[PDB]
C-alpha cells in the first residue's frame, strides 16, 4: 500500500509499505529515499510518536494515510 | 507573550510564556493546563523536536507562534 510521509515544514513523499512493516522498517525506507538516519526520525500518527518495534497494522494505519515525520538532531 | 500549542490530531490551546522560558518550563505550563506529564510531551518547531534545556528565544519563537505537540507514551 501507499502512505504519505509529511514534514511539518510541508515536504511530502510517498512510500510503499505493508501493514506488517514495523515503524523501524518505515524509517529504513525513509533513509533509503531521503538519506535521514533512523535515529533522527520520529514518526507520528493519531497525535502520538510511534514506537519503533510496532507495526503499521498495530496502529491501524490504512492505505493512503499520512504519517508525519519530525526530525531530531542535537542543536537543531 | 501568547503562543499557540497545537496537538497534531487534536486540540489547540493558548499559553502565556516568556522568551526566556525553557522548553521544560513550557511543558510544565502544558501540564498545569492539560494534565499531560512533561516526560510524555514532545514539542516541535521548524519541523524538529525541541530540547528541554533551550529557551523559546533560543529558537526565535516569538509572540503568536505555534508549537506542535505530540505525545510519547510510557513504554
Numbering used by the authors:
A (entry chain A): 1 to 76
B (entry chain B): 1 to 75
Paper text:
The ubiquitin–proteasome pathway is a fundamental cellular process in eukaryotes that controls protein degradation. Ubiquitin molecules are assembled through the formation of an isopeptide bond between the carboxyl-terminal group of ubiquitin and the side-chain ∊-amino group of a lysine in another ubiquitin molecule (termed the distal and proximal moieties, respectively) or on the substrate. Lys48-linked polyubiquitin chains are recognized by the proteasome as a tag for the degradation of the attached substrates. Most ubiquitin-binding domains interact with the hydrophobic patch of ubiquitin and thus the conformation in which the patch is buried will be referred to as the closed conformation.
In an attempt to obtain the structure of Lys48-linked di­ubiquitin (Ub2) bound to the Mud1 UBA domain, cocrystallization trials were performed. Diffracting crystals were obtained, but subsequent structure determination revealed that the crystals were solely composed of Ub2. A new crystal form of Lys48-linked Ub2 was obtained and its structure was determined by X-ray crystallography to 1.6 Å resolution. The asymmetric unit is composed of three Ub2 molecules that all adopt the closed conformation, as observed in solution and in the previous crystal structure, despite the different crystallization conditions and crystal packing. Moreover, the same seven hydrogen bonds were found in each of the three distal–proximal pairs, notably between the carbonyl O atoms of Gly47 and Leu71 and the backbone amides of Leu71 and Gln49, respectively. Despite these different conditions, the same set of hydrophobic interactions and hydrogen bonds were found as in the previous Ub2 crystal structure. The new crystal form reveals a new conformation for the isopeptide linkage, which interacts with other isopeptide linkages in the other subunits. The isopeptide bond is in a trans configuration in both crystal structures, but the carbonyl O atom of Gly76 points in opposite directions, which imposes a reconfiguration of Gly75 and Gly76. A network of intramolecular hydrogen bonds and water molecules that were not observed in the previous crystal structure further stabilizes the isopeptide-linkage conformation. A new conformation was also observed for the loop between the β1 and β2 strands.
